[PDB]
Amino acid sequence: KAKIGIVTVSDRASAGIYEDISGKAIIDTLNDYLTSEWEPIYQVIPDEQDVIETTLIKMADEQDCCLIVTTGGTGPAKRDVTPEATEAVCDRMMPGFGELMRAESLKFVPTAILSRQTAGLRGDSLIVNLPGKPKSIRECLDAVFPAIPYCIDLMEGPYLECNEAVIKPFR
Template sequence: MQNAEWNEASGSIDESWLTWHAVYRVIPDERPLIEDTLKQLCDDEGCCFVVTTGGTGPAPRDVTPEATEAVCERMMPGYGEQMRAISIKHVPTAVLSRQTAGLRGKSLILNLPGKPKAIRETIDEVFVSIPACIQLLEGPYIETNDSIVKAFRPAGLIRKSKPKS
């Protein structure tokens, strides 16, 4: 996703690299509201991939990981580990991050850091595995533009040919 742009003014990702519809919510750092919003996006909106930004530090108001864990059936700790490993190359305080990911039904929830620069650094690397994860959850087959991000899929998940429209 090398060319994806994070818009610092609006707090959103340039959708030109997406092949699906994006749904946005901007909410305060309040755990019950975060939990309700995550449930709504997964259960009511049917989002296969939910991304949060911010709220992953050690400050008392940083409760996004707790909200994510409360609504997920299973956690995906590898994403948090990878994001911290990426961030520690750029800033020593990355060890303070509590980024995580989890599964709710057929949805993957990913907690990204809050700073636009850190978001760009981490999403570029972790996104390569996300289409395979969503496919394993029986979600849609996500096509990617290889010049922007080349999704990694194990041999059993590679589509032999594109379906006819």
């Protein structure tokens, strides 16, 4: 059974928010994509690099998350430290992800180039930084998820199966 980590990074949501629209967008998108059974491991944390690092390490090392997706804290603002935390915990970066996510975003907004979203591997776990807006989250995942089930196969993880009328992963 596949375990997928979902991390909402936000001082605001950590302090208390009516709802977590970002985390929800990730869960709903994954539910739309996946016909195979999967289990979300979900945390809401503040913009604190040490905490983000700890959370990702726990998900990958102890909770066997084959994929971990983060949302928030990827811009130029002083407290946006999610990419740094990601780089800190991953041994092998995946530069193709950031490239594509920015390229797709750039079709809409020239500020796409301000995103420091990245991705990498910690051991057998893929970690991908997503943006904050639900619209953007779906657009982002639509672009990169088709490569993800195959990536997990190559890491000797669970075989993810998709609703091919919603998304078509290449293998």
